[PDB]
Paper text:
Human p97 ATPase is crucial in various cellular processes, making it a target for inhibitors to treat cancers, neurological, and infectious diseases. The molecular mechanism of p97 ATPase has been extensively studied with a variety of methods, including X-ray crystallography, nuclear magnetic resonance (NMR) spectroscopy, and single-particle cryogenic electron microscopy (cryo-EM). These approaches have revealed a dynamic molecular machine with three distinct functional domains: an NTD and two ATPase domains, termed D1 and D229–31, each harboring conserved Walker A and B motifs typically associated with ATP binding and hydrolysis. A stable and functional oligomer of six p97 monomers assembles without a requirement for binding nucleotides. This homohexamer structure appears as two concentric rings, formed by the D1 and D2 domains, that create a central pore capable of binding protein and peptide substrates for segregation or degradation. The triazole inhibitors bind between the D1 and D2 domains and at the interface with an adjacent monomer.
The two-dimensional (2D) class averages of p97 | NSC799462 showed that both hexameric and dodecameric forms are present, similar to previous observations on the wild-type or mutant p9747,62,76–79. The final reconstructions reach resolutions of 3.23 Å and 3.33 Å for hexamer and dodecamer, respectively. NSC799462 binds at the interface between the D1 and D2 domains of the adjacent p97 monomers. The inhibitor does not directly interact with bound nucleotide, but its methylpiperidine group approaches the D2 nucleotide-binding site of an adjacent subunit with a distance of approximately 8 Å between the methyl group on the piperidine of NSC799462 and the 3’-hydroxyl group of the adjacent ADP ribose. The interactions between NSC799462 and p97 are primarily hydrophobic, involving surrounding residues V493, P496, V497, P500, L504, P510, I531, C535, A537, P571, and F618. K512 and N616 make hydrogen bonds with the pyridine and triazole nitrogens, respectively. In the presence of the inhibitor, a significant structural change in the loop T613-V617 is observed (inset), which allows NSC799462 to fit the binding site and enables the interaction of N616 with a triazole nitrogen. The width of the binding pocket increases to accommodate NSC799462: the distances between N616 and V497 and between K512 and P496 increase from 3.2 Å and 3.9 Å to 6.7 Å and 7.4 Å, respectively. These rearrangements expand the volume of this binding cavity, induce subtle shifts of the surrounding structural motifs, and result in the helices, α2 A, α2B, α2 C, and α2E moving outwards.
Numbering used by the authors:
A (entry chain A): 22 to 714, 726 to 775
B (entry chain F): 270 to 714, 726 to 775
Amino acid sequence: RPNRLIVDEAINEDNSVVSLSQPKMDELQLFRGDTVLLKGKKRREAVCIVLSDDTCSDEKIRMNRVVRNNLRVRLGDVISIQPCPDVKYGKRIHVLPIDDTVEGITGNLFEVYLKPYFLEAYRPIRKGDIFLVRGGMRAVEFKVVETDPSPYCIVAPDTVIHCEGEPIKREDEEESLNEVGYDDIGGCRKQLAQIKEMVELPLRHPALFKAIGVKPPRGILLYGPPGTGKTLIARAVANETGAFFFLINGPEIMSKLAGESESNLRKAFEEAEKNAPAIIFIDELDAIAPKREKTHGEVERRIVSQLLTLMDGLKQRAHVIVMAATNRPNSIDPALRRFGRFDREVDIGIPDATGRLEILQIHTKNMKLADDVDLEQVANETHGHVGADLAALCSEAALQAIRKKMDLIDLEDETIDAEVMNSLAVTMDDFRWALSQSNPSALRETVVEVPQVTWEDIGGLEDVKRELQELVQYPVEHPDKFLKFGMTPSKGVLFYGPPGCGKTLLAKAIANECQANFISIKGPELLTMWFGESEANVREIFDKARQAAPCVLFFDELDSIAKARGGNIGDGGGAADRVINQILTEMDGMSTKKNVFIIGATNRPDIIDPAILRPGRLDQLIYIPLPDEKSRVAILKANLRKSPVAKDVDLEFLAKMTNGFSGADLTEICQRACKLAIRESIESEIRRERERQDPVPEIRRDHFEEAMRFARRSVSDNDIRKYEMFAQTLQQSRGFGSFRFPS
Amino acid sequence: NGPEIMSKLAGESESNLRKAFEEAEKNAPAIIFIDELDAIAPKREKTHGEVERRIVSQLLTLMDGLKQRAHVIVMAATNRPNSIDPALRRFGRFDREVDIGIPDATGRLEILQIHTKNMKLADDVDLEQVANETHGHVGADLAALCSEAALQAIRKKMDLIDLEDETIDAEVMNSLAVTMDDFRWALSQSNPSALRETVVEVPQVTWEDIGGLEDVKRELQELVQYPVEHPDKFLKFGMTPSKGVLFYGPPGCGKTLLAKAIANECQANFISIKGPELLTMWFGESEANVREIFDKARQAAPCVLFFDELDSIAKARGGNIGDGGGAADRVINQILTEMDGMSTKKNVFIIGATNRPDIIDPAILRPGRLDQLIYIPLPDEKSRVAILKANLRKSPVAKDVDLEFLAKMTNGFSGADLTEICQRACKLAIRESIESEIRRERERQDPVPEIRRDHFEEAMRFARRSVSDNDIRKYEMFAQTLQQSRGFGSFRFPS
Ligand SMILES: CN1CCC(NC(=O)OCC#Cc2c(F)cc(OCc3nnc(S[C@H]4C=CCCC4)n3-c3cccnc3)cc2F)CC1
Ligand SMILES: CN1CCC(NC(=O)OCC#Cc2c(F)cc(OCc3nnc(S[C@H]4C=CCCC4)n3-c3cccnc3)cc2F)CC1
Ligand SMILES: Nc1ncnc2c1ncn2[C@@H]1O[C@H](COP(=O)(O)OP(=O)(O)O)[C@@H](O)[C@H]1O
Ligand SMILES: Nc1ncnc2c1ncn2[C@@H]1O[C@H](COP(=O)(O)OP(=O)(O)O)[C@@H](O)[C@H]1O
Ligand SMILES: Nc1ncnc2c1ncn2[C@@H]1O[C@H](COP(=O)(O)OP(=O)(O)O)[C@@H](O)[C@H]1O
């Protein structure tokens, strides 16, 4: 039937709202705000309000867990839409707390949860349907029980809502909504999409491999630092097939004396498959099956080497998936990751500045987060916090709001009523304290990110941005033309230009335009590998890129080692280096990998191994010049955009003065102006406090006059001419001007 | 198959292993595959338990018992040979090792063609393109890829047919045209985490891709191909032909291409050890890795080793001072030590390429080692025409490009520089073609199907001679140092 679509992940946390592709709406005979009735796979029906997001395809309709398992429809299945509303808003509608969600809760939970969720929204309700409302640090779901016999009803002023109490819990047909799903993972939407695409076919349709000859993914190996959310992701995926997955987590297996483990492990495989498709999560495979190279007892060696043989047995059929988990892949015995034994590794990795924001929003979603929580600010403030840490933080703050409210309410247990738990407005002061307490001791390792900088933050460089758009973006949006001519485009760039001029910013902005996984390897990170004589770590770095593709590597200060030598003498690399040589060795390898882009930035382009400028390696050198007057205007505007500035600052003059400022120097002028602005503003707020014992709400033209006096050109003209000299060495003309193939 | 044997508690394995030998021979000739012998019989040097030592050392005694008769074969398997206890590879105990090795650019194409053979591979699958695209994919990965593509064609068709199992009919499975877009996605997903190690290959380059060098190709045909197709004449005179060459010549002039083409003409297993690969061994103070490299050649024969930038270490020293090798080096010295050993191996040919022939251990030019120095000169005008034609052969070029003039300009371009001119012409061609396809898209909101004489006019303006005349004369000076004449001109044994 054409009145059907496929359910997909929600765009918003609110329930009762369903997104439809705007082109699909009219053909579906639905309009901008109509009531979208829904008929699920089972003999189960519900209703929602229409919405639209242009990212939705005509195939997809977005429904979150509150609506999906209300139709008993797993994610990715067919939902039928049957619009036919009545005009009779519900009368005497009713609901109960017949659920385990209200364990220990006291007070009039009806007043705090149900009444605002109903009257503030005036949303459509249908009897028999479970609905989740979050607040008071609890997610409480109730099963409607009366709506009048109408197929749908909308709560309104004449809807005299009702409530009653009973002890009966949810039915077997109802999903345990207190446990995770797809919407409970925020930091790794890319890897989550990879995993769900990778295992939607075996698990949703295990027969769909049973019959055809393709061999399904028999083993997935999630990995990433502990607390990254690996077990969360596996549990979220398995909550579509949670018949027997849960009992089969295997971190305890390795620790039962001798064969008691080997027996247990067997049973773990034996019982997981016994009913429905099932996921067998080998939690902390790093411990059960470590590299045999570093074992000192045959009993543990036999444990690991009969993990493999129980793995191989599952190659016969598709309904079972062995989703392992580990801190890093090279800590496990390579006897795994064979064809059929954990064939597909997946790096969950630490969340980025926007992944942590999504994690914080996911965890806070049941807390009354107040009206001053700058989530975006803490998300950048909490760099390095791996996954579960943002979960601890979101509790450390919440508790900081309880322990500072539990003095007012002197109760000895939370038989304190839910209404005052709803009053726990967890202000940003509490989160400020919690961050000060929180420690990112899970890990802080080379971080792969989708940087949030964009062209509007790269003032000037009008030519270079075009020259990089036609270099990173043309070969990935018209590869037909690159095959038609056999070009083999350049998988490399070297930004040579004065330091502090916008090379790293350009690389981040490029990675952002393509929405690619930027991986910055700063100067100290390379120089440390050279110092420790541990150039082998480079093999790890590039490997991360090989896993993070589509990536944009970036070796900031790629000439760091050559500068830290002088480039003239040394037993070692002469002109070359340990780590630069390893970088060449790995660039040659990754020249195959079409997805990853490699960028380097050299503020000393003459002093650097010329072997890196060879074709295939960072071949396309791009000059990043000192900004000219107009580009200096652009840079000043870019840096002042994020700060309040009086409406009479003459920036076109502030650019004229800066005869040759690098971009960093103009940023430093902006920062000196800000510092002098807080000086002049603090020294008038404290003056006001003394008076009582917004002076200036913005920086002004006055403050720049003392901000500029601390200014430089961070590159002498003897360096500007050094880069011009390197350009003319690498501009490569030799009097072919006016050359023409004669007619 | 015996991968499970090592993991059954104590004697339960030792009994099982015996039964494995006992029952394999019971009917007809039978192969006994000791899967992952790396694990069952590791080097006893790195064991910490007597029971595992006894497992490995009663693998040997069950091996020996099979020397009595021929019908049973014990085909072991291992990641690498030196990880197994040398108690194996004795006479009669795994006497014959065989390196399957990673597939080459045409091996991977054959693997892909084998695995795709049941998939409706559509009409736009550039198998040859993915075969080069998928470098480093070891065997079964191309099998996973060939599934990742196929599934990418199912999961994008299973929306149309909303069935819950493949009781979907075979007819619409035949309609799963796995387009090259699906394989493009699958390659982006696929990871060659099996291994990426020094790759032995039969290169697909040939003479037609080596523009010019008409003299050098003959001089190498009579040097690598005469001693292997007329060895009667080399024994008849007792010549002991040269198992070595050093290509000294300006960098980026066609030395590695010549070596690959030579290996291809003989259909030999080329093994390139690039400059960074030697320089890495010298940095890590792990010259012992060279013993591995040459060993690969000893297993991959008929081979053509190739030490690109054989003077890499000397350049990375300056060749004047150092505690270390003075004029010599760690890794160059190890290379000499192994060249002396491999001078026995008749099948393998050893080639080196030096763009800095003066700064390199002269001990490597000794007879038996890379003795026959061959000069790889900068292309002359006709050879530049040849190089330009060779590089533009694979790309569409308008039928009015005046290549015999584009050669005249490039008074001293190396081969790499002319290839860079070709690549700049291509880059400006996509620029001018993309900027008219997007223009067409804006119009509706094949401009030029080929590069043209127009684009080379902006492609050439970014050109070099990558060697100054002070380097051309440096190589001429090294040649006259190694041309070795001293006025025996007109010398004649008088009648
Ligand atoms: C003249 N002689 C003739 C014969 C022979 N020539 C031939 O016949 O070969 C044909 C080809 C090709 C081709 C390509 F080489 C790259 C492509 O695009 C992939 C891509 N995907 N993402 C990226 S980067 C991007 C990913 C997003 C996040 C950041 C980075 N790239 C990409 C981009 C830039 C450079 N490299 C790869 C497509 C092709 F079709 C040799 C020369
Ligand atoms: C003047 N005093 C008199 C007495 C004494 N002299 C004497 O009596 O010795 C006689 C001899 C010989 C001989 C030989 F020395 C090499 C041969 O061919 C093997 C071969 N097979 N493949 C190759 S390379 C090719 C394999 C294909 C893939 C790539 C590489 N080669 C080969 C080719 C070039 C150089 N070396 C070996 C045959 C012979 F008969 C000492 C001097
Ligand atoms: N990417 C993420 N998105 C949402 N929650 C996360 C994420 N990563 C970690 N968490 C939080 O961490 C906890 C899961 O930790 P767990 O998976 O048990 O440890 P590990 O990740 O090491 O297996 C959950 O409470 C979850 O809310
Ligand atoms: N072109 C530019 N436009 C705007 N800001 C710039 C520009 N170039 C540099 N900056 C400023 O300099 C800093 C980044 O310097 P960076 O580009 O990393 O220098 P380098 O790459 O030479 O180390 C940022 O704070 C940014 O505000
Ligand atoms: N004689 C030649 N004929 C055709 N192409 C050549 C020639 N010499 C070099 N090239 C080009 O140069 C590249 C190979 O350079 P290479 O021979 O490896 O230089 P080097 O051996 O000095 O490193 C190829 O892209 C090839 O197109």
